[PDB]
From a paper:
Here, using functional metagenomic selection, we describe AcrIIA22, an unconventional Acr found in hypervariable genomic regions of clostridial bacteria and their prophages from human gut microbiomes. AcrIIA22 encodes a 54 amino acid protein that impairs SpyCas9 activity. Instead, guided by an X-ray crystal structure of AcrIIA22, coupled with mutational and biochemical analyses, we show that AcrIIA22 encodes a DNA nickase.
The asymmetric unit in AcrIIA22’s crystal comprises 2 monomers stacked end to end, with each monomer folding into a 4-stranded β-sheet. Despite crystallizing as a homodimer, AcrIIA22 migrated from a size exclusion chromatography (SEC) column at an elution volume corresponding to a calculated mass approximately 4 times larger than its expected monomeric molecular weight. Indeed, AcrIIA22 was predicted to form a stable tetramer when analyzed with PISA, a tool for inferring macromolecular assembles from crystal structures. This putative tetramer has a molecular mass consistent with that observed by SEC and comprises pairs of outward-facing, concave β-sheets. A series of hydrophobic interactions likely stabilize this configuration of β-sheets instead of the typical α-helical interactions seen in other PC4-like proteins, potentially explaining the absence of an α-helix in AcrIIA22. Consistent with this possibility, AcrIIA22’s β-sheets orient along each outward face of the putative tetramer, resemble those in PC4-like proteins, and form a groove that could potentially accommodate a nucleic acid substrate. Instead, we speculate that D14 may contribute to AcrIIA22’s nicking activity, as 2 D14 residues from different AcrIIA22 monomers sit very near to one another in our proposed tetramer, such that they may be stabilized via the presence of a divalent cation under physiological conditions.
Residue numbers in the entry:
A (entry chain A), B (entry chain A), C (entry chain B), D (entry chain B): -1 to 54
Write the structure that this text describes.
């Protein structure tokens, strides 16, 4: 724990990949993280590849 | 044209998706663009989904 | 040109500069672009300098 | 904890603040983290505030 995920959002999606946004809160500060999720044949996310996190 | 792609780079790759970086130069300014490329069964990129561009 | 400007907004203004926000839509996805406008003595904007674009 | 700090670097320093850079490696990918360190009267850093992390 320690850091808390407050919100997630699907920004763009494909058969195989999805661009994810998360709002993180750690030690009283708010961050916006953009990630790429990797989907298998069943449409599930098998790997998250964080791309960028920024203070907001 | 007008804007010039100066450099591209593979930051992370998967069977299906790749995280791309490009250095763009437009009107004398330099930008770093992060994108997600969508790959087909043959490993080729069929769609680029820009995620973020920032002045550097 | 593929991308469509859907909204602009004046976020902050100064004697010399103004912070502009735009919502861009390209290939069905929405982006938030922040720019800085340069104002002359006559109160007009003489140059717009894009700072960052991000998928929203 | 999955992610490994591989390099830190002092990019700029001031009476009160110091700009820190770190290279993080997680799941085989490398990230560049920029933080701000807060210095007290005794020249020591009292708080580190992460500003941005990006895949490189």
């Amino acid at each position: 724990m320690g850091m808390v995920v407050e919100e997630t959002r699907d920004l763009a999606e494909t058969a195989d990949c999805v661009v994810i946004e998360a709002i993180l809160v750690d030690d009283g500060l708010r961050y916006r993280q953009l990630s790429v999720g990797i989907k298998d044949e069943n449409g599930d996310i098998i790997r998250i590849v964080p791309i960028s996190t920024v203070l907001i």
